[PDB]
């Protein structure tokens, strides 16, 4: 009815960063492009950490913790966003846990695209910009993490979605009836059908010139699933072989046999 308006408003209310805000900054923040500028950013933006010995541990481990905290914050926003999607609040709690557990990282990497351009990505609530080359320059496996996300973002951003489209796309990701271990599949599938239907209708008027946008976006959801499959393999490598990269407990829960 007004389903699409309710989802857009929940998105604007619950996410601190979005594409309009991001593009204002991406079109100034502090550019992090080597060890030195990374240290300057830390000294001014997180002064308490620099005076607690965080500059002792590796640059990769510091960036790791930055990204980890961002994902943790975003999972909280995504949970609050999901609670405001009409129907989600009525699902069983375990079904609600399943949907978030398998859905948040597809949503995060979808939304990550909004804070990226070809040269780097915004960090620290839009006050920092870490360069693509600098991430590429870190030691394995860290230099392997963001690069496929940049690749996804460049094509995803070429579709020229705005926040109203992205809000429906993310809602479709969360309300996914084929997540493993779902109980009330028939009702969640019905929720997705409604969301996907209003997304198709919204794309028809918001992007009247790209008549093929809707099936392109459907394929992007499949690409995100694969993207998260590959990303989880990087998480294991970190779990297995990195001493100072402790996984946040909330994230350990999400990644448990996914």
């Amino acid at each position: 009815k007004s389903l699409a308006k309710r989802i857009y408003e929940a998105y604007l209310k619950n996410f601190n960063m979005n594409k309009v805000k991001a593009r204002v900054i991406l079109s100034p923040p502090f550019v992090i492009h080597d060890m030195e500028t990374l240290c300057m950013a830390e000294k001014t933006l997180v002064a308490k950490l620099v005076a607690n010995g965080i500059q002792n541990k590796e640059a990769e481990v510091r960036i790791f913790h930055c990204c980890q905290c961002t994902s943790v914050e975003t999972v909280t926003e995504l949970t609050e966003f999901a609670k405001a999607i009409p129907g989600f609040a009525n699902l069983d709690l375990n079904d609600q846990v399943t949907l978030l557990k398998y859905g948040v990282y597809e949503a995060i990497f979808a939304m990550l695209s909004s804070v990226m351009n070809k040269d780097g990505m915004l960090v620290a609530y839009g006050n920092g910009f870490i360069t693509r080359e600098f991430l590429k320059s870190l030691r394995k496996p860290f230099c392997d993490i963001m690069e496929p996300k940049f690749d996804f973002a460049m094509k995803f951003n070429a579709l020229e979605l705005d926040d109203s489209d992205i809000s429906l796309f993310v809602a479709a990701i969360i309300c996914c009836g084929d997540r493993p271990g779902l109980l009330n599949v028939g009702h969640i599938e019905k929720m997705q059908e409604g969301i996907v239907h209003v997304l198709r209708l919204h794309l028809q008027s918001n992007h009247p010139d790209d008549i093929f946008l809707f099936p392109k976006l459907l394929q992007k959801m499949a690409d995100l699933r694969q993207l998260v499959t590959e990303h989880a393999q990087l998480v294991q490598i970190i779990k297995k072989t990195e001493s100072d990269a402790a996984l946040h407990p909330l994230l350990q829960e999400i990644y448990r046999d996914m």
């Binding site: 949970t79 609670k83 609600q96 846990v97 978030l100 829960e253 999400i254």
Partner: peptide, 11 residues
């Protein structure tokens, strides 16, 4: 127990 549950059950 589950941290995702606590997120979902919060005010």
């Amino acid at each position: 127990p589950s941290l995702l549950k606590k997120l979902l059950l919060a005010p």
